[PDB]
Amino acid sequence: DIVMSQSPSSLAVSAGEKVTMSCKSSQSLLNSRTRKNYLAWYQQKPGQSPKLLIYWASTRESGVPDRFTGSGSGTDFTLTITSVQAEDLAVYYCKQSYNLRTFGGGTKLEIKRADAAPTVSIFPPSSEQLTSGGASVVCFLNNFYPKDINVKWKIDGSEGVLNSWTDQDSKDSTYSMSSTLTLTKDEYERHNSYTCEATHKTSTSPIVKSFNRNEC
Amino acid sequence: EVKLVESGGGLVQSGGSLRLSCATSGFTFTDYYMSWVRQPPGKALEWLGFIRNKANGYTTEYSPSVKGRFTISRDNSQSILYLQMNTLRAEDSATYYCARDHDGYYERFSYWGQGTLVTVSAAKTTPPSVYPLAPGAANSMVTLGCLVKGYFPEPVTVTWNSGSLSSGVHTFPAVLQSDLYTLSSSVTVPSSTWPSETVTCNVAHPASSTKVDKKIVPR
Numbered sequence: 001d002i003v004m005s006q007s008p009s010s011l012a013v014s015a016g017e018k019v020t021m022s023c024k025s026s027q028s029l030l031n032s033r034t035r036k037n038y039l040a041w042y043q044q045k046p047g048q049s050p051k052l053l054i055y056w057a058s059t060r061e062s063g064v065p066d067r068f069t070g071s072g073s074g075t076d077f078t079l080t081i082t083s084v085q086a087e088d089l090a091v092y093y094c095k096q097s098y099n100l101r102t103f104g105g106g107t108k109l110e111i112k113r114a115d116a117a118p119t120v121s122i123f124p125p126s127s128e129q130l131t132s133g134g135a136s137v138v139c140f141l142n143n144f145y146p147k148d149i150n151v152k153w154k155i156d157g158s159e160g161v162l163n164s165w166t167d168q169d170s171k172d173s174t175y176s177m178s179s180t181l182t183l184t185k186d187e188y189e190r191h192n193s194y195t196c197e198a199t200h201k202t203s204t205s206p207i208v209k210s211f212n213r214n215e216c
Numbered sequence: 217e218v219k220l221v222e223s224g225g226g227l228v229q230s231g232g233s234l235r236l237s238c239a240t241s242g243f244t245f246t247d248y249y250m251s252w253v254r255q256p257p258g259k260a261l262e263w264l265g266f267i268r269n270k271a272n273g274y275t276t277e278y279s280p281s282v283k284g285r286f287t288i289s290r291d292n293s294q295s296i297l298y299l300q301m302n303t304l305r306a307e308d309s310a311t312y313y314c315a316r317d318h319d320g321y322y323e324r325f326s327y328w329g330q331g332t333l334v335t336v337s338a339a340k341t342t343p344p345s346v347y348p349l350a351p352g353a354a355n356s357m358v359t360l361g362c363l364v365k366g367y368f369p370e371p372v373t374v375t376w377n378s379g380s381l382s383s384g385v386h387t388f389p390a391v392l393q394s395d396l397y398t399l400s401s402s403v404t405v406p407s408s409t410w411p412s413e414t415v416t417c418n419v420a421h422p423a424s425s426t427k428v429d430k431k432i433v434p435r
């Protein structure tokens with residue numbers, strides 16, 4: 001069958017630096033009739049469809065930046081990105097069309113940038129939720145780098161949580177995370193102080209955001 | 217302008233069937249092979265099959281992963297591509313894309329649709345509750361949000377001010393917890409602009425045909 005394999009699985013590169021990624025096929029993709037390699041590269045940015053970048057191994061599609069170059073032949077192929085930009089964050093797939101079609105497993109390109117502290121916001125439950133008998137408390141930790149972050153919830157001073165990270169931002173290369181604590185209304189109404197505390201490598205001091213039910 | 221648009225995705229039970237469509241314009245449809253490609257959430261693209269062009273008699277080919285279970289057809293009068301899926305299983309849950317394929321000359325998929333999400337599950341459709349996130353008691357900038365809680369299946373769409381607020385928006389990927397998804401979206405604006413101007417999140421959950429506008433009101 002034709003097995004397509006890519007390397008690395010993932011990597012991170014700083015803007016302005018060079019990116020190199022590899023694609024191997026189990027059979028030569030060099031078509032003897034046309035003497036071209038039937039190997040294409042696609043870029044898939046977060047939440048978007050794949051977009052054609054390169055085909056016949058080295059032909060750059062119109063509208064694709066000069067910084068993307070495809071190379072190689074037979075069983076081994078390379079996509080090179082020079083002077084990588086923040087917007088280049090994506091999964092990159094190679095695909096053979098020598099015999100039907102088969103995609104590689106992809107390479108995830110992340111962007112390395114300077115450490116950045118999160119901006120933290122806390123939100124009390126809405127009255128339209130409380131009327132239903134539930135109480136969700138939400139904390140947004142926005143625009144930070146790197147991705148690893150710790151969130152603790154404290155209720156009346158002591159430590160049902162959904163955490164979600166965004167994909168990296170295409171413009172500033174930061175991450176954001178939402179943490180949701182869900183309680184029953186009966187439990188919510190027993191306590192006064194609700195606190196989310198974010199600890200990130202950017203400070204030894206946790207960022208603490210809080211509200212008190214009596215001040216609502 | 218080339219357009220490809222998939223439709224027909226949604227929730228179906230294991231063992232069930234579903235047919236997807238892909239409407240096209242902006243090119244000579246019969247000149248082109250057309251492929252279907254799927255992608256399970258967070259996983260790689262998988263080529264499924266193609267149907268050839270007029271020159272090659274509109275014959276079909278399939279990955280062994282789906283041969284005998286999926287069928288590709290095309291309406292050449294209307295420039296529409298179809299995928300008939302039978303005996304669906306958990307592993308078929310994925311975004312399905314149509315892609316314009318070979319023309320006899322170029323080896324490339326030049327264009328792809330936006331994709332349509334198929335969920336194979338016994339779970340019921342459940343519309344979201346949508347709750348505003350307004351600051352408590354608590355700056356140059358202000359951050360607001362909406363919490364889109366307890367829905368099934370994916371997806372939902374979230375916009376702010378009918379898409380006029382796009383900068384400074386973050387939508388947090390849905391997380392599944394005890395059989396329902398919850399997602400949230402944040403928007404950051406200058407505090408001189410809210411609450412003096414209206415900020416509203418617009419939420420749609422196609423499986424339940426839910427449409428919600430939730431104005432973010434100061435407490």
Ligand SMILES: C=CCO[C@]1(C(=O)O)C[C@@H](O)[C@@H](O)[C@@H]([C@H](O)CO[C@]2(C(=O)O)C=CC[C@@H]([C@H](O)CO)O2)O1
Nearest residue numbers: 031032033034038097098099100268272318320323
């Ligand atoms: C039009 C015929 C073949 O094209 C496909 C196909 O299976 O339909 C699709 C193409 O993307 C590519 O995979 C080619 C494959 O390269 C075989 O194509 C050639 C060849 O390159 O040798 C080209 C012309 C004739 C054909 C066969 O000998 C007879 O149809 O081989 O296949």
Ligand SMILES: [Mg+2]
Nearest residue numbers: 142143169384
């Ligand atoms: Mg941001």
Ligand SMILES: [Mg+2]
Nearest residue numbers: 155187190191
């Ligand atoms: Mg307690």
Ligand SMILES: [Mg+2]
Nearest residue numbers: 276277278283
């Ligand atoms: Mg057969």
Ligand SMILES: [Zn+2]
Nearest residue numbers: 156190191192
């Ligand atoms: Zn207490």
Ligand SMILES: [Zn+2]
Nearest residue numbers: 275276277278
């Ligand atoms: Zn055949």
